[PDB]
C-alpha cells in the first residue's frame, strides 16, 4: 500500500550506466514528498511535470531507471542534450515526462585508487534511441581491417571503465542518477 522508493533510493549498488537498472513501480500509493523534500539530491530537474505539485497527479506507470555516470555528465541526462552518455549510453527521450533526481556520491562509490566497476560505453556505432540499454561489448572496429575478437591497432573495446577516486574534481566524481519516468 505504498510504492517502493526504498528499493531504488536507499540501495547499495546503483548499476553502471550501460546496464541502467529499471524498476516498474505500480499499483501503490507513491509519496514523492520524501524525495523532493530530501536535500541529499543535487539535480531534481523535473521536465514535463512540476517538481512541487507532483504528489496529486495519478501517474499511470512509473519506471525508475537508475545508474552511475561521471560527475559532469548530469547534463547528458536531460531531454534533448546529446553526447557520450546520451547517444552511447542512456537517452532521455525528446519529450521526457518525469524528473532526473541525482546525488554526486563520492563516499559510497569512490575508491582511493579507483572503483573501476562503474563503467561507461564510448565508441558505439548507433546513437541509442530513447530508453535503450546496449549491454553488448563487441570489439568496436573503426579504422578499416576488421579485427573481430582481438583488441589492437585502430580497434577499441567499447565498455571503458570510469575509475572514480575520492580526490577527483566534483565534475569527475561518481554521480548516481535515478530518472523517474512517469506515463
Amino acid at each position: 500500500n505504498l510504492c517502493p522508493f526504498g528499493e531504488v533510493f536507499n540501495a547499495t549498488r546503483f548499476a553502471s550506466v550501460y546496464a541502467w537498472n529499471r524498476k516498474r513501480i505500480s499499483n501503490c500509493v507513491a509519496d514523492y514528498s520524501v524525495l523532493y523534500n530530501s536535500a541529499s539530491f543535487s539535480t531534481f530537474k523535473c521536465y514535463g511535470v512540476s517538481p512541487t505539485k507532483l504528489n496529486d497527479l495519478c501517474f499511470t506507470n512509473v519506471y525508475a531507471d537508475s545508474f552511475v555516470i561521471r560527475g559532469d555528465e548530469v547534463r547528458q541526462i536531460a531531454p534533448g542534450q546529446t553526447g557520450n552518455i546520451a547517444d552511447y549510453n542512456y537517452k532521455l527521450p525528446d519529450d521526457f515526462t518525469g524528473c532526473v533526481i541525482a546525488w554526486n556520491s563520492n563516499n559510497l562509490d569512490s575508491k582511493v585508487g579507483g572503483n573501476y566497476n562503474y563503467l561507461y560505453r564510448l565508441f558505439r556505432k548507433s546513437n541509442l534511441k530513447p530508453f535503450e540499454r546496449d549491454i553488448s561489448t563487441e570489439i568496436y572496429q573503426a579504422g578499416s581491417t576488421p579485427c573481430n575478437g582481438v583488441k589492437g591497432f585502430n580497434c577499441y573495446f567499447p565498455l571503458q571503465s570510469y575509475g572514480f577516486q575520492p580526490t577527483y574534481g566534483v565534475g569527475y566524481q561518481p554521480y548516481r542518477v535515478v530518472v523517474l519516468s512517469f506515463e
Epitope: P4, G6, E7, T12, N107, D109, K111, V112, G113, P166
Partner: antibody, heavy 118, light 107 residues
Framework: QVQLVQSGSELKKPGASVKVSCKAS????????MNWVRQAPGQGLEWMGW????????TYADDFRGRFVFSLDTSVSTAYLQICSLKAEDTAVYYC????????????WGQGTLVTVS | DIQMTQSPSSLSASVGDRVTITCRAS??????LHWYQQKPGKAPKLLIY???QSISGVPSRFSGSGSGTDFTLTISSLQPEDFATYYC?????????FGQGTKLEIK
C-alpha cells in the same frame, strides 16, 4: 597478518562518553570502509554505519543517528568509534568490521568491546 | 528495514547429518545475502557471501544457495563443535540487516 585489534572491555556510568578503538593492519587501510556493528547479549548483530577511510564522513545507520560518532584518525591505521551519553540499554558489544565500499559483506572481525553499564 | 527472518529458531541436529536453515527477506535482497556464524564469546566469521560463492579458507562442509527472498546454506557434513548462532545478512538496501539467528544444538 590482516587483523583488527580492538579496545578492552569498557565499563562506564550511564552518561559518560567513551571511545572504542579499531586499529587495523595488514591491508591497505584506505581501500575498504569501516562498518561498526553492535550486538546486545540476547539479540543479533546490527550494522551502525561506516566511514569512508579517505574522508572520515560518519554515515550512520538510520537507527543509530544520534549520540554515536565514528572518529577516524587515518595515517595511523585507526578507525575509532565514540559512543556518547551512554544509556543503560547499550550494554552490548560493539564490533569493528572491515566491510568495503563495493562489497559491504563484512567478514565481521572485531574482538568485541564488552560495554557493560550500570 | 529489510525484515530478515531466519527459521527455524532453534533446530537441533546430530553428528554427521545434513541440516538446512532457511532465511526469508521481507522485501527483495535479490542475491546479496551473506552468511555468518558466531560461536559464543567470539567475533563472527563469514561463511557464504552473495549467498552462493564460498569464502576462501573456510572448511567447505557447508555451502549456500538461494535467490530472491529465499536463502539458505545446508551443512553437508555437520560436526558437534559448531553449535553456531548462524546469521543471515543482506547487503542490498541500507541499513544492512542481519537475522536473529538459528542456534544449533546437539541432542
Amino acid at each position: 597478518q590482516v587483523q583488527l585489534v580492538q579496545s578492552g572491555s569498557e565499563l562506564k556510568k550511564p552518561g559518560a562518553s567513551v571511545k572504542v578503538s579499531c586499529k587495523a593492519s595488514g591491508y591497505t587501510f584506505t581501500d575498504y570502509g569501516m562498518n561498526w556493528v553492535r550486538q546486545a547479549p540476547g539479540q543479533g548483530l546490527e550494522w551502525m554505519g561506516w566511514i569512508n577511510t579517505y574522508s572520515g564522513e560518519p554515515t550512520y545507520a538510520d537507527d543509530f543517528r544520534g549520540r554515536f560518532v565514528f572518529s577516524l584518525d587515518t595515517s595511523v591505521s585507526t578507525a575509532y568509534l565514540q559512543i556518547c551519553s551512554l544509556k543503560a540499554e547499550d550494554t552490548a558489544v560493539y564490533y569493528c568490521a572491515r566491510g568495503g565500499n563495493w562489497d559491504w559483506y563484512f567478514d565481521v572481525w572485531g574482538q568485541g568491546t564488552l560495554v557493560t553499564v550500570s | 528495514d529489510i525484515q530478515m527472518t531466519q527459521s527455524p529458531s532453534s533446530l537441533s541436529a546430530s553428528v554427521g547429518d545434513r541440516v538446512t536453515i532457511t532465511c526469508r527477506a521481507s522485501q527483495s535482497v535479490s542475491n546479496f545475502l551473506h552468511w555468518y556464524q558466531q560461536k559464543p564469546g567470539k567475533a563472527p566469521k563469514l561463511l557464504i557471501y552473495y549467498a552462493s560463492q564460498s569464502i576462501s579458507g573456510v572448511p567447505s562442509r557447508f555451502s549456500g544457495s538461494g535467490s530472491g527472498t529465499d536463502f539458505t546454506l545446508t551443512i553437508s557434513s555437520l560436526q558437534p563443535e559448531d553449535f553456531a548462532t548462524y546469521y543471515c545478512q543482506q547487503s542490498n538496501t541500507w541499513p544492512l540487516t542481519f537475522g536473529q539467528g538459528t542456534k544449533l544444538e546437539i541432542k
